[PDB]
Design a protein around this ligand. Structure first.
Ligand code: HEM
Ligand code: HEM
Ligand SMILES: Cc1cc(N)nc(CCc2cccc(CCc3cc(C)nc(N)c3)c2)c1
Ligand SMILES: Cc1cc(N)nc(CCc2cccc(CCc3cc(C)nc(N)c3)c2)c1
Ligand SMILES: C[C@H](O)[C@H](O)[C@H]1CNc2nc(N)[nH]c(=O)c2N1
Ligand SMILES: C[C@H](O)[C@H](O)[C@H]1CNc2nc(N)[nH]c(=O)c2N1
Ligand SMILES: [Zn+2]
Lengths: 404, 403
């Protein structure tokens, strides 16, 4: 009967309909002919309608839709575009749009926390040193000595024919990737290019598997300036296993604060090219993807050898065994170091709770199944059995071209 | 318009040009992707589908545009033109069924698509006959543990009349008995089909692994009930290579995975009963069938057996027990000398399959959420491979339950 997508949970046998998708004003990659769900990467009038939509969302969200303060703000926005081509957000509109952006992000399993985000307004920032300061305050606040708090620092928006504010690094904390003159990679192979870029702008490079990179920060129309994070601010966790005593001797570690810095925050048309945000990790990001991907640290074989497994064949399930212990080592060490982390079971459960809230509040929740299901123990988590609708709402986070 | 398909482990890129051959729409639109849903909710069409298929056949055997090619297109026009339908020649049928497997976007086993034994059962007029055919297929496919893939094609659907159907969703299935307190004894997925069996006069067991009888239906007749001779149903008692206690759980699973509720479409013809079988990939037994909360749900028990900390999700008791259960399965199948494939070997081989398909056809429809195993996904190479999904024909479809 209802002509909205029917959404089923195959474990519990329950059924919903996503009506929220009707609100989507941007096309994704799929068509009736073929599904492109698994791919990672798929102006006056145009700006004004995006701005009107957002202001409408704002007033809705405080329950004053249609009111004269709503029609006045609408008027104020169109007046400001009329004469300058852009406009600006009130403080509390930025706070709402930034949260709304996290809320709308289809690939984030952490959304249950969407309403608990600290928004640092940094639209006054006018230099690269100042960005540094702002970022340090961020890390300091967000890190909070282990008791991690979600936050986002918002720098000034794209302006017409004026350079963007850009953080070159893809995350605020990143280990160096040193290309060897024997093809291989020392450190994190994900970070090869940014390392090369830092060195070229005059960083004296280290030599280790876990060297914290400096920040490359770009004020409008200036070459990027290089900034070393003072070590005492970058909280790391040494990794050790609860029962395998030799795991500590591997000298593996990860940093506490996952802070993404290369995304664009789009709110009602306006684009914030430098709006770094952070939360806390899910255990599989480090334990499974970062440490075990063949194209990352790739420690799987090393660990299984230590665990004395048969690596000559697949049917020993040697990879599955080691993956689990590496993950268990991530959880145990973070717990021991009193640093916030969430395991993939706890995390997905809370995402199911989120789906139920959003069903009630908005009529659905855009979700990307391939990304919400964790990279180990998929069907062991309730999300695997949950059909999901994926679509682009706004405000949003967006990828953007690398500044170089 | 041609999708760029990337492998993020190796950084290699291809292009799907095979998706341009799709003639049937999927559930996605530009507005929203519905790729994670399980079910998707006359003389000119049949004639053109028919044509396209016959072409696929002659081109397949390189005789395209030739003598027997034009003259077979005539046989088909003639036959539809005057009877509103037509019939397939055995070899064309053999080709269609191989191709429907090849086109199956959710199948990880397609490296094998060319090795398929095809039984023509189109001369069947009775559930009786259907059964005899069903037993031959089982005997053949099972081959004393050395599983061989097979399909058995019963007569096509027909305008005037009811379908030949096999009511059971698989050929071998364990009973599910809904007990006093809304509990379930045995396989919870087969409560409905156990109930139907009981309605049509089957005396039920009361164990956890009671092989169900088959309900087979010939057109417009009530279904009939047939009991598989226990010797034709090869079963593997599960044990663990190091945990001596695991066998005491009394767990087991059947060797032959043979699907029987799926419709086979070839050149616009529909085959409502065409059971097919190959061999299990281990995660199906070890992870979905035994650990799914709405299946046998053995995860907690194993874990307690393993003296693991059940109190908390962070001890990874779920993941640990799951690995050992999947191990017990491979060990057991290996010990009983019955074909099985782990999810590492399977996906490795599927990768090779995408490579052949790339050279051979310009693409391969695949369904990322089904190709990636239910545990240890990113530990397998398919996890890092982008994939295009779309519907090619010949095809397997779902069809409504006949009751
Ligand atoms: C609070 C704890 C959080 C957890 C556990 C969490 C978890 C995750 C995970 C596991 C992913 C998939 C990442 C990957 O595998 O690469 C993700 C994606 C994402 N996260 Fe969250 N997150 C959290 C907080 C946040 C915050 C504070 C924001 C921003 C305000 C955020 C925004 C996003 C966005 C936009 C994506 C999509 C990335 C993409 O589109 O490629 N998350 N998150
Ligand atoms: C021979 C070894 C085979 C292996 C290892 C294998 C493996 C699998 C697996 C793991 C699935 C996912 C389904 C699930 O988890 O429920 C699947 C799906 C499928 N398989 Fe295969 N399979 C094999 C043979 C065959 C054969 C012989 C056929 C038919 C000729 C076939 C046709 C299909 C189809 C049509 C699907 C998709 C079902 C759907 O859309 O729900 N497979 N296969
Ligand atoms: C806040 C946060 C929490 C968490 N648990 N993990 C992370 C790290 C995972 C994460 C989250 C968002 C965004 C990204 C990457 C964004 C990104 C950007 C570009 C340009 N290309 C890509 N392929 C990807 C990664 C971040
Ligand atoms: C040949 C084969 C090999 C293998 N390893 N596993 C299987 C079993 C998995 C499998 C494959 C295709 C099709 C199904 C049917 C799933 C299914 C689908 C619908 C709509 N209703 C149901 N009751 C059941 C199941 C079959
Ligand atoms: C091809 C595939 O979409 C790609 O590897 C995706 C799969 N799911 C993912 N899910 C998360 N959370 N992160 C990822 O990087 C990926 N990779
Ligand atoms: C809703 C979700 O798509 C559903 O649980 C799917 C996910 N992936 C799967 N993958 C396989 N191979 N088999 C399945 O039954 C499923 N179930
Ligand atoms: Zn799609």
């Amino acid at each position: 009967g209802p002509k909205f997508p029917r959404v089923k949970n195959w474990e519990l046998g329950s059924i919903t309909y996503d009506t929220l998708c009707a609100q989507s004003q941007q096309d994704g990659p799929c068509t009736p002919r073929r599904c492109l769900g698994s791919l990672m990467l798929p102006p006056a009038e145009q700006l004004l309608s995006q701005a009107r939509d957002f202001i409408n969302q704002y007033y809705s969200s405080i329950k004053r839709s249609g009111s004269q303060a709503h029609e006045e703000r609408l008027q104020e926005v169109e007046a400001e575009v009329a004469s300058t081509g852009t406009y600006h957000l009130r403080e509390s509109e930025l706070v709402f749009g930034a949260k709304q952006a996290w809320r709308n992000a289809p690939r984030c399993v952490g959304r249950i926390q969407w309403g608990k985000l600290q928004v640092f307004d940094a639209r006054d920032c006018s230099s690269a040193q100042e960005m540094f300061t702002y970022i340090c305050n961020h890390i300091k606040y967000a890190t909070n000595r282990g008791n991690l708090r979600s936050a986002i620092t918002v720098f000034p928006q794209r302006a017409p024919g004026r350079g963007d504010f850009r953080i070159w690094n893809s995350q605020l904390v990143r280990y160096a990737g040193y290309r060897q003159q024997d093809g291989s990679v020392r450190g994190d192979p994900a970070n090869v290019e940014i390392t090369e870029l830092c060195i070229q702008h005059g960083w004296t490079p280290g030599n280790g598997r876990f060297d914290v990179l400096p920040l490359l920060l770009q004020a409008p129309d200036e070459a990027p300036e290089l900034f070393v994070l003072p070590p005492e601010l970058v909280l790391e966790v040494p990794l050790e296993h609860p029962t395998l005593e030799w795991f500590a001797a591997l000298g593996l570690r990860w940093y506490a604060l996952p802070a993404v810095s290369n995304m664009l925050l789009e709110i009602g048309g306006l684009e914030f090219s430098a709006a770094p945000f952070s939360g806390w990790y899910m255990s599989t990001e480090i334990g499974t993807r970062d440490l075990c991907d063949p194209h990352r640290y790739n420690i799987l074989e090393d660990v299984a050898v230590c665990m004395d497994l048969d690596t000559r064949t697949t049917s020993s399930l040697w990879k599955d065994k080691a993956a689990v212990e590496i993950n268990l080592a991530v959880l145990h060490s973070f717990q021991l170091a009193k640093v916030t982390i969430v395991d993939h079971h706890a995390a997905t459960v809370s995402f199911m709770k989120h789906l139920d809230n959003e069903q009630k509040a908005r009529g659905g929740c855009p979700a990307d199944w391939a990304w919400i299901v964790p990279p180990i123990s998929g069907s062991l988590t309730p999300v695997f059995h949950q059909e999901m609708v994926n679509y682009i709402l706004s405000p949003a986070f967006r990828y953007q071209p690398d500044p170089w």
